[PDB]
Amino acid sequence: YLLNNGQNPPAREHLQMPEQREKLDGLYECILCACCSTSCPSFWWNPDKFIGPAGLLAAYRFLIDSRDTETDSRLDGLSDAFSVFRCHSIMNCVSVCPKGLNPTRAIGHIKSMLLQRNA
Amino acid sequence: MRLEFSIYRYNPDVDDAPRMQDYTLEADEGRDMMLLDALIQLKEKDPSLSFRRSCREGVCGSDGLNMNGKNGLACITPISALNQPGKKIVIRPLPGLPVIRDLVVDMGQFYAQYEKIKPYLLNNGQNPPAREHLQMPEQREKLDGLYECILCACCSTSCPSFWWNPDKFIGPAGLLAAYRFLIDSRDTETDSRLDGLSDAFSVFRCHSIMNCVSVCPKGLNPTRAIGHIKSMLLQRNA
Amino acid sequence: MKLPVREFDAVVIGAGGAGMRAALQISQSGQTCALLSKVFPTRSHTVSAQGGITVALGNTHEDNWEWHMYDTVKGSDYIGDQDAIEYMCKTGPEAILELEHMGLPFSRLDDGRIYQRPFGGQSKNFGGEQAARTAAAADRTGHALLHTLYQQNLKNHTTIFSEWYALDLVKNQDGAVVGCTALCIETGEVVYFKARATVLATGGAGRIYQSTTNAHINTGDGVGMAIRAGVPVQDMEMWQFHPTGIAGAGVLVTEGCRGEGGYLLNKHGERFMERYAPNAKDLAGRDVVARSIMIEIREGRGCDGPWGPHAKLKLDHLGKEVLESRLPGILELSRTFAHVDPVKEPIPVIPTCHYMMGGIPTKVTGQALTVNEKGEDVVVPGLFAVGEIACVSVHGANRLGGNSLLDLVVFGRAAGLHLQESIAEQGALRDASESDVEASLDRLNRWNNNRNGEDPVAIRKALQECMQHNFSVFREGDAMAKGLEQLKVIRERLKNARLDDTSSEFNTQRVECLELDNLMETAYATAVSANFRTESRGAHSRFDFPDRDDENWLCHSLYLPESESMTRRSVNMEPKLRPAFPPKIRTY
Amino acid sequence: SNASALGRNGVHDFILVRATAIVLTLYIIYMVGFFATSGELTYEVWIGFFASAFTKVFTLLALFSILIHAWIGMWQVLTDYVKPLALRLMLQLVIVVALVVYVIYGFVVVWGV
Amino acid sequence: SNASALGRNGVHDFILVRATAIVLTLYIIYMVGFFATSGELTYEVWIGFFASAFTKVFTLLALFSILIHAWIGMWQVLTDYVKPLALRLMLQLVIVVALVVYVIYGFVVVWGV
Amino acid sequence: SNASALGRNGVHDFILVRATAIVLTLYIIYMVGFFATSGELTYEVWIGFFASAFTKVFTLLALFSILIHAWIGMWQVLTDYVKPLALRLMLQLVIVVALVVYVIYGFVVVWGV
Amino acid sequence: MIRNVKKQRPVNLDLQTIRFPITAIASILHRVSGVITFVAVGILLWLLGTSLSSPEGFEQASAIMGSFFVKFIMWGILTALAYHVVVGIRHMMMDFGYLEETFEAGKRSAKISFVITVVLSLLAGVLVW
Amino acid sequence: MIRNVKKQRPVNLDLQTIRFPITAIASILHRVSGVITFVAVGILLWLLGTSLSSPEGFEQASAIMGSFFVKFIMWGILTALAYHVVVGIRHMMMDFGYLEETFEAGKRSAKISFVITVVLSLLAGVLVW
Ligand SMILES: CCCCCCCCCCCCCCC(O)O[C@H](COC(O)CCCCC)COP(=O)(O)OC[C@H](O)COP(=O)(O)OC[C@@H](COC(O)CCCCCCCCCCCC)O[C@H](O)CCCCCCCCCCCCCC
Ligand SMILES: CCCCCCCCCCCCCCC(O)O[C@H](COC(O)CCCCC)COP(=O)(O)OC[C@H](O)COP(=O)(O)OC[C@@H](COC(O)CCCCCCCCCCCC)O[C@H](O)CCCCCCCCCCCCCC
Ligand SMILES: *Cc1cc2c(cc1C)nc1c(=O)[nH]c(=O)nc-1n2C[C@H](O)[C@H](O)[C@H](O)COP(=O)(O)OP(=O)(O)OC[C@H]1O[C@@H](n2cnc3c(N)ncnc32)[C@H](O)[C@@H]1O
Ligand code: HEB
Ligand code: HEB
Ligand SMILES: COc1[nH]c(=O)c(C(=O)[C@@H](C)C[C@H](C)[C@@H](Cl)CCl)c(O)c1OC
Ligand SMILES: COc1[nH]c(=O)c(C(=O)[C@@H](C)C[C@H](C)[C@@H](Cl)CCl)c(O)c1OC
Ligand SMILES: O=C([O-])CC(=O)C(=O)O
Ligand code: SF4
Ligand code: SF4
Ligand code: F3S
Ligand code: F3S
Ligand code: FES
């Protein structure tokens, strides 16, 4: 869910230039059909520790949402050895997604924001 | 006599790149005035010239400015101290922060770090007092040189470590504030506050350069405070 | 429909002592709320406060609030309301202990040269009280109290619109107050802040003079919106001229000096205050102590120097320690603005404009009052005021030193505690049409289109020169009479004024211009009031009526406006409290 | 901070792996280049190639790099397939002691030439 | 994460200690077995036992194991008895430099044989 | 816990730096004292000074100390001036591989004497 | 079912049932190659040890690489190593930014990989012999 | 200005504009000396390497230190090293408690430092030659 600290409230709705909103495409569409996660070995081995493709797309969904202000907080929360890094780029997720979404591309971004923040 | 000035100018809607505009002020030669005074005059000459000011007595932190390559408060920097024949009187914004207009910087990241270190008392309420809190003069003495900061943003603005990591390193003004509550008899989250500062940037970016002490309008000493915070850190995590 | 609207259940114009206290309190009661401020909240004039917060805590010596009422009533000159003064002094102790729990850097009692006590807040001696009840954090109490409240607001995540300039209030078709307009100095954009409660906490404005202890900021803005909109303005002639200011600077030096043992002398070495105020000495009331020095100046018997006709404030006899522990703030203000180390030589002081008693007439709960056809008291819908711009009638004709801050918190907070209730009582308020709002921008559009007019510096300087002579400490009918005209000239003159800078990014000028209308509209009622009152009481001091008219003038002078139309004058009263208090002699 | 993992967290493990890869890549190239330019290896050409300061330093900078790299990888595998805690810790223990010995025996082999 | 402790946390210290114990146990047995089958030690039997690749690698795998093991233990003690912060840090510093030197001198002794 | 920093946190970095300084100070003094009492350096006096067990152990205890010390300092600098992430990581990688090699080449030089 | 608490649900995990993309075959092998290379170093250090020990040692080393059983092994190692390096570099290319993280792009990379690996496996054998 | 989103505010950072205390000059140099000493060790290990390798090596080493271009360098290193140690010890003195953390006290320390450094730089040169 969105996490906005409310600092600098908007008059009516939130400031969102199409360029930014474009960033949510391929992320807010997931239907939680559980196809990908269900097709990922890393998930079969650590269902409870590794977040999986569907969640990682969701994680990324709020990481790049102009309206979400806890980006740094969310990032620290994913910096353990299992949450994100169990992904080995096998790609069955992309391979099967009914809605044509790409979890691996999103995960690679999340990983990139991680290096940026903790390296 | 005649006073020569060299001031920083920048209007985002006019100028597409900063510059220094020349100013002359034939102020009466009876006595000396404050740089703020001088500024207000030129302000009558030139209305487009803008800067911040208020209490005028060096207690609000409003006219934070870098005059002659050294930060200080205009409301109390005697013109005497800035006049040297032939040459001019340079006046620019505080180093580091984004410039909004002329000599008015967005004090954003400053206040930001201010908050990170929790600028308020945190008492768990355990063992309430009947009326006010138990505070022996000996303890209250410890707050001197800490509760006085006026958030004039001079020091932080004069610290290289801040220019490089405005967002990560807390800076001199915040660190004095951090310490302000670390040694307050009434604050009960001392250990919690300490753990919160034990990363590589918050406190440890300070290399004891000392420009902060060097410039503080209120004569405060951030380096001495930081060294204490560092000491409470070793005590707790070593 | 083209202006942006920010709807809040409340809007607090001004983030100083009282604003932030009420802001914080309104927020407490699950009320949405926006807090505006011309400058960064901590820069507010309240930081400069020195003395302390006088309140019967009983820490330095046994005590009781009642002695605080008497000491204040006699200080207002039996023109201050017993009901408000009562509530204030009774509710005082708690209200203050409360700030100490937020972390206020109070000074404490214990081992001293010749004093000892536990930990409680230290209370220094002040003028108007029999002993010491003034709680202070050294010489910087206000700086402690402002910052604390900002830290609190920092903590309780209050919504703050820093450096936003309020333009004018917005009136409801049914004549109510539904918010206000405002300019964001940074971006220069304009916005209307719609609210079910609009709280003015714009402070004082002794800038309508040439020499003031106030800041370049106190420009009656609150006053000039409460008039431009239609709301009355009480005791607007009651202006407190602090006894001890700095000659040439205007910069104040805490009455706490006398409180610690300071001397107020003349060139012949005598203590004219021991003479003027026999038994209450230098501890005498504000108004009294004011004239005494201003008199030795008319008689040509007042010390002089590069600084000017003054009176010595000897403190050097105290300990260099007591000076650096109990008045560290004075030592710096005297050395810098008065080139005189207090530890070794007296300070060049002169009674200069300080506090502004009068302002928006309000009930304890903070609601703004006007009059009815008959002249009755009719609560203004949507408008409340707290602080200095407020005239809740608690200081009357002469504010008792150290009480202002007390007022700030007690009533600011009372303004909050009572808000939900108040909004109920007034019931819904209808919207405002593009016309109602458009009205409030009139002043703005003026300055922005009138580019060839007259330079505003002169108007300001004149506005300040006049007000300085005709309405200084002492004044008389003919004086007021003359300036009361010079004003109309300038008030009209001011109508052709110009705005040279017309940019968006931080227009320092537009704000000063705008503040001018307010500086004007203020000093004006000030005069109309000063003249009108035919008596000598507290601040008001006429030579034609050297005594107080107890039968005709035991009341509040209420200036009646109509926006930009013609003016008026009126009255108001109040002495029915609880334990009861009768008029009397005023011999300090 | 998993007590059996080398890195302090994910990012540490990710980075340590990648860096050692690069080092371990250059070393292999360098080692392949040599061999591909030898064919008939004379005990004189051989012992002369390892006598080189450059070869000893790289060889050992590699062994050390393998410890770090392999430790992390193998920890990643056991973490997936070896669910019983007791069995796994014994495996990391065997593996780690193995990796250390690779390096130590590495020094012993090198200074003996 | 205590800056004077080796491990990152409790579990790290607990585990590192235990593993090095086991390694340090085998090494002692191995060293006891030898001596118990010697009695009269001839400079030839002695220098021949340390000439063995196996003995050098174990000896050093031990020294390295002691550094890790002893560092943690000694940190555990000082942590209990040495309350004054300044005194303690100096002690860990002396102790640690001592442990490192044990290992380094270990290599020096070994390759010299 | 920044993945490119050596220490686990601030206090770890602060402490590791300070301790290695002290060690690195003694070593320099010791190395200065020697040279200041030599003037004319004969290959016999030279190779005899490094033949000493004491000199080998200190020299290497220093190289190891530099790795730790310099790693942290250089990480502190790059952290300030080198803003682009990709460029910086490559720099720490070059620097670190450099520091390791200093030590390894250190052993190689020493046991060869 | 524990002790006096019964029933545990089934799970579909028949790997012969599930169908795997090439990109999946690519990673699984990379891992397997990793564990293989780990044991490999031990063997190589053993051989490198014999190799430099002295002339008698060098001979004894050559003689072992003579056996064709050894050659076959020495070849599978170099091949497992080879595979693992190439696909590692692939990994890293997608880690930084030299490869689209799309599926097709994934199969292409994977393929181009196996190809390079086989080429390198080839040379490896040329050397082993 | 990104892509279809314009304007970025200026920042005052002209270091020739700003004026620095001696205490600031002291630290900046300490850092610079640090980065210098880092490269320095490499050079010294190279020389120490040649030095002990054999007699031909020792000679070749002496001969290099002969060049006056080398001497100048070998001198700046020892000097950068020197500076860095002294000021490091200063650091540590303020870290523990052998120095008031006041500004004056700061300038004094800084000065007393440069002085000792120059003295040590002097001896360094005496040795280099
Ligand atoms: C870009 C990515 C980079 C790729 C990375 C992948 C690397 C792995 C892939 C391996 C590829 C190898 C390719 C070799 C190659 O190219 O062979 C070449 C062939 O080129 C052609 O055919 C020309 C065609 C051109 C077409 C354009 C050269 O081969 P030759 O002709 O010399 O054939 C041998 C000859 O018959 C004559 O042979 P001989 O009689 O001299 O043999 C003697 C035999 C026995 O000698 C001994 O007893 C000594 C053994 C010493 C073993 C040392 C092992 C070192 C371990 C170090 C571990 C460090 C941790 O010798 C053996 O057959 C030699 C075996 C060599 C194995 C080399 C492997 C090294 C791996 C090092 C890195 C290990 C890393 C561990 C983590
Ligand atoms: C309290 C704080 C402590 C301070 C810390 C700061 C330290 C840095 C400052 C350096 C100060 C050096 C001071 C030297 C000194 O005192 O010189 C003395 C001079 O004293 C006077 O003048 C008397 C005045 C008394 C007044 C009261 C002695 O000098 P001599 O008289 O012997 O002059 C040489 C002679 O001409 C006769 O000279 P020669 O002919 O014998 O020269 C031969 C020349 C070539 O020999 C070779 O080829 C061998 C080179 C070997 C290099 C080895 C480098 C080792 C690197 C180790 C790295 C380990 C990581 O020799 C060279 O000129 C010798 C160069 C020596 C450089 C020594 C530097 C060592 C740094 C070690 C620590 C490095 C740490 C890295 C992190
Ligand atoms: C001037 C002075 C006053 C003073 C004192 C010393 C000096 C130098 N020492 C005192 C003392 O020891 N004890 C005491 O009881 N009073 C003392 N005083 C007087 C006291 O400071 C004032 O009465 C008090 O500070 C008034 O407080 P208040 O909270 O009402 O006002 P504050 O003065 O600034 O803040 C007003 C706020 O409103 C904002 N504002 C004003 N106009 C606008 C517009 N147009 N738009 C938006 N905001 C506006 C200000 O920005 C400020 O936040
Ligand atoms: C090229 C470069 C490189 C190299 C050389 C290498 C080399 C190596 N390696 Fe490596 N790796 C790598 C790159 C690499 N690598 C990578 C990239 C990875 C990743 C994986 C994931 O992520 O998953 C690995 C991973 C890995 C692992 C893990 C597995 C999984 O998948 O999980 C292991 C075990 C290893 C081992 C190894 C060894 C033994 C060696 C030899 C020394 N690896
Ligand atoms: C005396 C002692 C000492 C010594 C010997 C040293 C030695 C050294 N070092 Fe040092 N450092 C030091 C002490 C020291 N040190 C200190 C104290 C510091 C700190 C800094 C700060 O804090 O900032 C340093 C720091 C440092 C750094 C960082 C920079 C800054 O400032 O940031 C570096 C890079 C270094 C390097 C180095 C080297 C290379 C060497 C040689 C081996 N360093
Ligand atoms: C490199 O990452 C991986 N890639 C994979 O294709 C993968 C798999 O797909 C598994 C079917 C293969 C695995 C070794 C089976 Cl035979 C053991 Cl029961 C797997 O388990 C894996 O580890 C997380
Ligand atoms: C040791 O700490 C420090 N001390 C300093 O005086 C300092 C500085 O004052 C900078 C003006 C110097 C710096 C190297 C410039 Cl030339 C690069 Cl653009 C600086 O950047 C610094 O690093 C944080
Ligand atoms: O409140 C007052 O008027 C007293 C005051 O300002 C002071 O003592 O400084
Ligand atoms: S398969 Fe596609 S739609 Fe379904 S969970 Fe995965 S991302 Fe979401
Ligand atoms: S410590 Fe001094 S210079 Fe720094 S912000 Fe506070 S008052 Fe300003
Ligand atoms: S299948 Fe799994 S490994 Fe990442 S690559 Fe796709 S979520
Ligand atoms: S200027 Fe900066 S480095 Fe610490 S020493 Fe003072 S805050
Ligand atoms: S205007 Fe208040 S300190 Fe300068």
Side-chain angles (χ1 to χ4, degrees), chain C residues 544-555:
Chain C
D544 347 308
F545 325 83
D547 310 65
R548 76 186 216 210
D549 200 308
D550 236 51
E551 272 198 56
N552 283 302
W553 288 123
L554 189 65
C555 42

Side-chain angles (χ1 to χ4, degrees), chain F residues 2-99:
Chain F
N2 218 278
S4 49
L6 222 213
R8 299 193 266 280
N9 60 34
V11 202
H12 195 53
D13 269 348
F14 185 73
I15 274 194
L16 285 180
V17 170
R18 276 64 181 164
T20 50
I22 304 174
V23 180
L24 279 170
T25 284
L26 304 172
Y27 182 67
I28 295 182
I29 294 180
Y30 172 93
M31 282 301 273
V32 161
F34 166 78
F35 271 106
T37 311
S38 306
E40 279 154 45
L41 198 58
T42 305
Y43 179 64
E44 321 310 308
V45 184
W46 194 225
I47 194 194
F49 174 58
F50 277 72
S52 173
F54 200 93
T55 288
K56 303 179 173 197
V57 181
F58 221 173
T59 300
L60 296 183
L61 168 75
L63 296 157
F64 182 68
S65 269
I66 302 179
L67 152 50
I68 299 173
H69 191 89
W71 183 326
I72 302 178
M74 299 309 305
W75 174 83
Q76 276 174 183
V77 168
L78 289 168
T79 286
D80 273 347
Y81 308 152
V82 188
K83 294 310 165 103
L85 176 56
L87 181 68
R88 211 178 65 258
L89 295 182
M90 178 209 114
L91 282 160
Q92 281 150 194
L93 180 59
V94 186
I95 279 175
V96 172
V97 178
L99 290 178

